[PDB]
Design an enzyme around this catalytic site. Structure first.
Site, PDB file in Angstrom:
ATOM      1  CG  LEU B  28      -0.974   1.320   5.678  1.00  0.00           C
ATOM      2  CD1 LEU B  28       0.089   1.118   6.731  1.00  0.00           C
ATOM      3  CD2 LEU B  28      -1.923   2.421   6.072  1.00  0.00           C
ATOM      4  CG  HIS B  29      -2.826  -3.019   0.145  1.00  0.00           C
ATOM      5  ND1 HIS B  29      -3.475  -4.093   0.711  1.00  0.00           N
ATOM      6  CD2 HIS B  29      -2.595  -3.357  -1.145  1.00  0.00           C
ATOM      7  CE1 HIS B  29      -3.621  -5.042  -0.194  1.00  0.00           C
ATOM      8  NE2 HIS B  29      -3.097  -4.621  -1.329  1.00  0.00           N
TER       9      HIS B  29
END
Lengths: 298, 187
Positions: B28-29
């Site tokens: 996600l990052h």
């Protein structure tokens, strides 16, 4: 009366090797025979053993060979001769009704999706598994799968997977020598951390000869995750075929002996008192016999 | 934001929920660096403050087009068989609001000693007398364990969900989906 045998030792069918992990770059996987091996290097945090790819390498090639033996119901040690004859007749009626067809379909699926890449698969970008049937040393039949298209949860039918399942069927039925060379490439990224098996300075990683590796029993436990016939709450997928089929990560043992779905009561009902269970539960019993072990009292 | 997507971990035989939680947070990052912008924030609905557990859900908050872009990107490739998606749907109303900010700590006194050496040209004994061992702070916070791609270190990113507020204020988010001022609806 036909009591169960006091000793039973089943030899392990589906023998894998230790999975040698090397490293390289993607889009030259077809020349991956001289790839440098992933070395276990030590670093200070205490000190631990870490395993990374090279900084110019974004592909992990895990390679092992898998030998499918056949002769699954025959024990390697058994006291009672009549029990051995009854169990051999039981497994013979199993193979007569249905060959090793669902079992080899699920084993070929667990080879197809790179589940033997344990932690090197959950963050991978694209995984490709090549499976070569080695007859007389060179090749007999080459396979190539997108292991991310083939899910870990669903056993979906396929044209090539049917062929690999027929090969593992011909191995498990004893109608041919089957040796599969299973390579698997994993786009993890440049210099990302790989996860070989872990030995017993806190953390020691498994290495064969200055080259990181996964244990053979870990690859074998990844191949045995075919059990979908346990009482399934919680939406958990396939589990590894064990008597009292248990997952140590979740800490819960499915197929408890309170219910009649563990390996031992199913085998005793099928062999002693001729209570043949459902087709799925007898698939589970034959998967345990392929797994091998010590099934008997004191 | 007004749209949310709930991402739940499927239970796995081979993996604990914290490991898959960390891998999902890492991808996600990387997806937020690949997208850019400060408009996307996250939340953890089944958080347990008593046992310091993040649960098995991640709730990402953004616009609808951002969520539908993030459904079809390769940041979920390889994670699709460990997860199950809902739909990008509108947040129910009314809901309290709270902040999701990373809480760092001085857990390594020796690193601060090396910083004092670099900034004041002191010695080891001067830094060890100036910084004793009692300044280290251990956190009762749930956390995810990420590996950096720029540097070669693995770090525990501790998370604290802030106090419930009846309304939200303007603020951006980092590339980790975490509050640099912004607030997410808590439900």
């Amino acid at each position: 009366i036909l009591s169960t045998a006091s000793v039973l030792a089943f030899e392990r069918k589906l023998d894998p090797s230790d999975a040698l992990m090397s490293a390289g770059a993607w889009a030259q996987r077809d020349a991956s025979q001289e790839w440098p091996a992933v070395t276990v290097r030590e670093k200070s945090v205490q000190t631990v053993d870490v395993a990374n790819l090279p900084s110019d390498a974004d592909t992990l090639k895990v390679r092992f060979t898998l030998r499918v033996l056949g002769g699954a119901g025959t024990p390697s040690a058994c006291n009672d001769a009549a029990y051995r004859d009854k169990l051999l007749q039981t497994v013979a009626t199993y193979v007569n009704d249905q060959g090793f067809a669902e079992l080899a379909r699920r084993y070929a699926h667990n080879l197809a999706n790179a589940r033997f890449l344990w932690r090197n698969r959950v963050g991978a970008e694209a995984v490709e598994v090549r499976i070569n049937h080695i007859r007389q040393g060179e090749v007999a039949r080459a396979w190539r799968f997108d292991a991310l298209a083939i899910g870990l949860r669903d056993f979906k039918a396929d044209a090539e997977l049917d062929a690999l399942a027929e090969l593992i069927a011909s191995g498990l039925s004893g109608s041919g020598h089957v040796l599969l060379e299973v390579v698997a490439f994993a786009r993890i990224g440049d210099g990302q951390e790989v996860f070989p098996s872990q030995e017993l300075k806190s953390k020691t990683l498994y290495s064969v000869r200055d080259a990181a590796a996964i244990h053979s029993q870990k690859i074998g436990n990844a191949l045995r995750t075919i059990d979908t016939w346990y009482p399934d709450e919680d939406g958990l997928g396939p589990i590894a075929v064990e008597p009292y089929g248990s997952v140590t990560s979740q800490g819960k043992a499915y197929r408890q002996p309170k219910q009649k779905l563990d390996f031992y009561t199913l085998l005793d009902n099928w062999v002693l008192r001729d209570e043949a269970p459902a087709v799925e539960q007898q698939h589970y019993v034959i998967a345990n016999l392929i797994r091998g072990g010590v099934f008997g009292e004191a | 934001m007004d749209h949310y997507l709930d991402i739940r971990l499927r239970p796995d035989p081979e993996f604990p929920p914290a490991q898959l939680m960390s891998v999902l947070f890492g991808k996600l990052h990387q997806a937020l660096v690949a997208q850019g912008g400060d408009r996307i924030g996250v939340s953890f609905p089944d958080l347990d403050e008593s046992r310091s557990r993040l649960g098995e859900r991640l709730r990402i908050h953004a616009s609808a087009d951002d969520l539908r872009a993030l459904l079809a990107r390769p940041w979920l490739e390889g994670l699709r068989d460990h997860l199950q998606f809902g739909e990008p749907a509108v947040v129910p109303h009314p809901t309290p609001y709270r902040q999701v900010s990373r809480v760092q700590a001085k857990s390594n006194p020796e690193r601060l000693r090396r910083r004092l050496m670099r900034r004041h040209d002191l010695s080891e004994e001067e830094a060890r007398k100036r910084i004793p061992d009692t300044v280290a702070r251990a956190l009762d916070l749930p956390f995810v364990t990420l590996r950096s791609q720029s540097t070669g270190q693995h770090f525990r990113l501790f998370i604290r969900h802030g106090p419930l507020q009846v309304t939200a204020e303007e603020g951006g988010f980092t590339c980790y989906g975490l509050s640099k001022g912004g607030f997410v609806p808590w439900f």
